[PDB]
Design a protein around this ligand. Structure first.
Ligand code: HEM
Ligand code: HEM
Ligand SMILES: CNCCc1cc(F)c(F)c(OCc2cc(C)cc(N)n2)c1
Ligand SMILES: CNCCc1cc(F)c(F)c(OCc2cc(C)cc(N)n2)c1
Ligand SMILES: C[C@H](O)[C@H](O)[C@H]1CNc2nc(N)[nH]c(=O)c2N1
Ligand SMILES: C[C@H](O)[C@H](O)[C@H]1CNc2nc(N)[nH]c(=O)c2N1
Ligand SMILES: [Zn+2]
Lengths: 415, 415
């Protein structure tokens, strides 16, 4: 029952008992593994009252077990108190402290996150008093400014009010708070970021006047209490950006690339004690590969491996001349060097995967486990030269959690 | 029931119905995914008579469905014929054709194999008449010579006689037919290949006179009909080797590395219709990364990233100077270039992963699926610049299959 996971670079073995507290399902069966499906039928988020108290109870029982006073009268009475309020309102409200705990443990439990060694150092911004798209914008700018901290980035999350009936739903329609624009071309090609081309046209549908260039920071599309969303543009001074130069190649400035400092995922659902927070944007700092490998070199993204290999003077005819590999390392050396010479917080994929193994160690000791998705933990380049490649990982689903959810423009009763 | 898998670089979708014919279990449950455990409790191989005919029946039913004459009298009578022989002997014997089919489909079903586009072009060598360690040696040399084909490598498998009672068990004790020796040092370090140090000392235990150097090709340790194994050394002329030079760096010869042409896994079990072939060595050709990334650069293997970065003139102080990445591409450019200038069959990780996606396509059309292990299919460097990174894959276990098995020196009743 109490399963073993081994490291095959160090022969270290740890025991996972944490997977017994696990509740949610994975998509795998005894006869089929889905560990490489992207948005499994489980990982995406209408829930009634009768189901709510067991979820409320289970969360409150682990939160009081956390502050060491499990079973005390404060536990017993808060149990009865929430019970009573779920009778009355068929929902309930989290204590300020229960929100910080749940938020921090949703991140802690995110099995696809390699940065979780920092899970407790998270700044929780309670925006459950917010009532308008403008109030959302104001909270979001205060988050951007705070988390950016003049390049010395800090982890944070802003939590807008919980879903209630369903038709009243706070949603940031952006996938990340800071994203570059995507414009298709008259010749069928694409300027900027091809991922966002669909969203970029929704923004222009709602009145965005596009500057039709490369790295055009998109505006926010904020939906408040189930209403129709509204465009707001983050003050340019609040969006920090890093221009990408190389420490050897003085032709790398001519490439003219740049990336924003702050990764801030905004389209996810935060679940705490059965309550569903439909808008909860959260930020940390970048691992280099997310920009240098995936962002710049994905085929359906910026796809610069073409030009980078050109200026490098590379054998670009043969597939097996590994020109793609060679230009990929130079690109990620440049993202790192640029962010670091500007005191903008960035982590390389070696340092971050070592931290996770270190993190994993503490989790198996003082918690009995650490759910981890190998498919996602392993960096997208130089896999087996980083220690996580050789680390077996048990994946399983614990709550509080971050879940995917449908994009709003497919579900919103428009007008 | 009939699950979808998507590509997120091309938006291609395929439907998997093949997973319905699946029989064996994976290790995952509805509440836990094991897709990154290395030797799962299932993937490793004493079986009685009553269980044998359903397995014999199921295999014969798909083999006759293969030659288009499913349900014919040849099918009906071969069914009765094997049934009768499993009454009489409580085992049975495969037709020469049933052995070629089962062997080819064991490979076809190997979900961790990226090379399976070639699954039908496999040369089956029937060594079920073999009775001695010398006969095993003779079959194995004929395999080495054939599969090597003067550098124009060809896929093959030699199948020694099936397990019967259990205590009579043909086993190649080597993990691969051609492997370099592993010697620990007086200072605690290691010369040669650290993986094999345990096996290298068993060979010297049984009389191997070690030339205590780097790339010393080990000798075979062959156990015949459950007997004690015996050392034989493959004629040096039959072991083809590639010295590793770089197409730019004339200091790369000075590194003095070399690798053997023929990957030939020998320690696995071949299962066909409930019959267990405990010795079945099989070979193809190398994907570059297996040598350049894993073999040369694994920490517990040859670990050359050290010296390669030195001669390259590299920033080796900082972790984030990606010196490890940079030297890893040069190393794999050199393995490829060396093998190719010698007409020794090698495939680069881009060409081989494109072939697999192409392969996957045909499998989902003319078979309804293709079991695949993402954790193993993705090359161990430059993950997301190869198309398999973006390909969802359903893993599941179909038979005929290759299974792991215990090493013999832990299970053999010695004398
Ligand atoms: C502090 C520095 C952080 C680093 C270095 C980091 C790193 C990463 C990376 C590289 C990924 C993979 C994303 C991708 O490749 O598309 C990821 C995923 C993720 N991270 Fe972290 N992250 C950090 C902070 C955070 C924070 C503050 C949260 C939440 C409060 C978080 C929760 C998550 C979640 C929910 C996922 C995705 C799981 C999924 O897709 O199902 N991370 N992280
Ligand atoms: C023809 C050229 C071939 C190529 C390019 C190729 C490539 C590969 C590679 C790179 C691996 C991963 C091994 C590792 O990383 O440790 C692998 C695994 C494997 N291959 Fe292939 N291979 C070839 C031929 C074959 C043949 C002839 C067979 C069997 C008849 C086979 C069956 C397997 C099996 C059983 C595994 C391992 C599955 C496991 O570990 O459970 N392959 N192959
Ligand atoms: C299909 N691709 C989905 C991309 C994706 C999905 C998520 F659900 C994430 F959470 C995520 O996070 C990226 C990230 C976030 C933070 C806070 C720090 C950091 N370094 N990286 C990225
Ligand atoms: C813990 N590591 C286990 C290593 C391992 C285990 C297996 F079960 C394999 F089958 C294998 O095959 C490597 C290989 C074989 C062939 C025929 C061609 C090729 N290119 N590569 C390697
Ligand atoms: C097909 C596969 O599920 C998909 O490409 C995944 C693989 N692993 C990943 N890992 C990370 N960190 N980010 C990703 O977007 C993905 N994509
Ligand atoms: C921990 C993990 O299961 C282990 O390192 C696996 C990962 N994927 C692999 N993939 C291949 N091709 N070969 C391997 O040896 C491994 N090792
Ligand atoms: Zn699984």
């Amino acid at each position: 029952r109490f399963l073993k996971v081994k490291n095959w670079e160090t022969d270290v073995v740890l025991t996972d008992t944490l997977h017994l507290k696990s509740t949610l399902e994975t998509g795998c069966t005894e006869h089929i593994c889905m560990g490489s499906i992207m948005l499994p039928s489980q990982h995406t988020r209408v829930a009634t009252k009768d189901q709510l108290f067991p979820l409320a109870k289970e969360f409150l029982d682990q939160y009081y077990s956390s502050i060491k006073r499990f079973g005390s009268k404060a536990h017993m009475d808060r149990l009865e108190e929430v019970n009573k309020e779920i009778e009355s309102t068929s929902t309930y409200q989290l204590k300020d402290t229960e929100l910080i705990y749940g938020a921090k443990h949703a991140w802690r439990n995110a099995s696809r996150c390699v940065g979780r060694i920092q899970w407790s150092k998270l700044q929780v911004f309670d925006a459950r008093d917010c009532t308008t798209a403008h109030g959302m914008f104001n909270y979001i700018c205060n988050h951007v400014k705070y988390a950016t901290n003049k390049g010395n980035l800090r982890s944070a999350i802003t939590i807008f009010p919980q879903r209630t009936d369903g038709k009243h739903d706070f949603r940031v329609w952006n996938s990340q708070l800071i994203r570059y624009a995507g414009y298709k071309q008259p010749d069928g090609s694409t300027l900027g970021d091809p991922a966002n081309v669909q969203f970029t046209e929704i923004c222009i549908q709602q009145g965005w006047k596009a500057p039709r260039g490369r790295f055009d920071v998109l505006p926010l599309l904020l939906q408040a209490n189930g209403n129709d969303p509204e465009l707001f543009q983050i003050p340019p001074e609040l969006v920090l950006e890093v221009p990408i130069r190389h420490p050897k190649f003085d032709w790398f400035k001519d490439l003219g690339l740049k990336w924003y400092g702050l990764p801030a995922v905004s389209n996810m659902l935060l679940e705490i004690g059965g309550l569903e927070f439909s808008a909860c944007p959260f930020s940390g700092w970048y691992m280099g590969t997310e920009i240098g490998v995936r962002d710049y070199c994905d085929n359906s993204r910026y796809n610069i491996l073409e030009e980078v290999a050109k200026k490098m003077d590379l054998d670009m005819r043969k597939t097996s001349s590994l020109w793609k590999d060679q230009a990929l390392v130079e690109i990620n050396i440049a993202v790192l060097y640029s962010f670091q010479s500007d005191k903008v917080t960035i982590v390389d994929h070696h340092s971050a995967t070592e931290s996770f193994i270190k993190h994993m160690e503490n989790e198996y000791r003082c918690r009995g486990g650490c759910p981890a998705d190998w498919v996602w933990i392993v960096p997208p380049m130089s896999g087996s030269i980083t220690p996580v490649f050789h680390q077996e990982m048990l994946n399983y689903r614990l709550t509080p959690s971050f879940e995917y959810q449908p994009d709003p423009w497919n579900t919103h009763v428009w007008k």
